[PDB]
Every structure is written in structure tokens, then in C-alpha cells.
Amino acid sequence: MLTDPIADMLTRIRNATRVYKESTDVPASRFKEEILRILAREGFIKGYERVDVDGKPYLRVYLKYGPRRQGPDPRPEQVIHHIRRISKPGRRVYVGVKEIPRVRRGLGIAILSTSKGVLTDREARKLGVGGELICEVW
Template identity: 60%
Template sequence: MLSDPIADMLTRIRNATRTHKETVDVPASNFKEQLANLLVAEGYVAGVERTRLDGQPADVLRLTLKYGAKREQVIKHIERISRPGRRAYVSAENLPRIQRGMGVAVVSTSKGLLPDREARKLGVGGEVICVLW
């Protein structure tokens, strides 16, 4: 059993992009699906599909990774911030600006999972799940 399934998902994405894989499979959950859809909306992942592999009891999320014209990584850095042992909550005023606005901090708010720009615009804070650029 994993103690931090979100960190596992981020690690799978990080490892897959570094080895230039086309897709990566992640055990599915509703939260992970929301996170994956946010990564698609922000342009870091090409697509996400919830499916069940043959002979597997649980669903998986199949993320189609995105690369540049010369196969350079779109996701240069991805890091878990709030962990089970150390939660990181911030107010709307203290939301981090990642790479001077070129990166994204994923924030879990009362309005759902939001990128830092949108959370700042709505004036809501929350738990900083991860950052990426």
C-alpha cells in the first residue's frame, strides 16, 4: 500500500518524461483524474483516459505525454509540495508564483483543483499539491 498516491503519480510522470515514453499508466482515483485533467488544460499533458486493463481489478489513468518539436520535455520539473506528513496550506495572498508565472502550482481549494493563477484571481487559498514547469 502506498502512503502517498499523488507523489507516486508525479514520480511516474517524471520518470516517463525523462525516458521519453509516449504514455504512462497510473492507478485511478477521482482526485488523480482531476489532477490529470488540470495538467491537460494547462498544456503539460496531451491527454488522459480512464480505462481498465485486461485482467486488472481496478481502473487506470492512461496519460499521453507531451513533448516539443525536437522531443524536448514539456515538463521540466514536477515536485510534490504538500505531503501526508507535512501539509502546505497558503492563503490567496501567499500563493507561490512559479518561475515568474511560467510554471504552475496546483492548489486544492474549496472550488476544486485550480492552477495558482486562477486561485489568485478567485481570491481563494488552499493546499498546494504540487508545482511544475
């Protein structure tokens, strides 16, 4: 019955890419949008459109991967290697703005919800706010 729909999505994504796949369809939600609307704006996906599967409104999300490779296991590097949720449903994690994580030494993003929108580690620091550290991606 999905406890935390997000960490689901987040996983759907994670799972799709391990085999490298056109797209995948998290069941839709304005918030799952918002979140996706940052994976893409930050270059982790090609992006996403709204769709349907029997009146049921999901989100077609187009993944991004690397270039082919020489040698054995020519499988591409990942645009999204790592994506693991924080502030979980069984233990919300919040943060003051000074408390905000510095993911992967700048090479990464810490998506996170706040009173002035779903910012990012830099977007929040710059906007000078904090809130539910939603997850870390890279």
C-alpha cells in the same frame, strides 16, 4: 502500499518522460483525474483516458515532449521538465491567497486543492482563494 498516491502519480509521470514515452498509467482516482485534468488543460500533457488492467481502473496519460534536436543527444526538450510535490503527507502545506506562490516567474503553475475545486496559481488568485498547495509544475 503507497503513502501519498499523488506524489506517486506525479513521479510516474516524471519517470515516464525521462525516457520519453507514449503514455503511462497512474492507478485511477477522481482526484488524480482532477489533477491530470489540469496538466492537460494547461498543456503539459496531450490528455488522458480511463482504462483497465484486469478490472483494475487506471488512467492512461499521454505525455507531451518537444521537437527533435540537432547535434549530439538529439533528444527532445521536455514539456514537463520539473514537477515536484509540495504539501506532503508527512507535512501538509497550506496557504492563504496572499501566500500563493508565483511559480517560475509566471512560466509555471502551482496546482493546489481548495474548497472551490482544484484551482491553479492564477485560477486561485483570480477566484480569490487558497488551500493545500498540492504541487508545482513547469
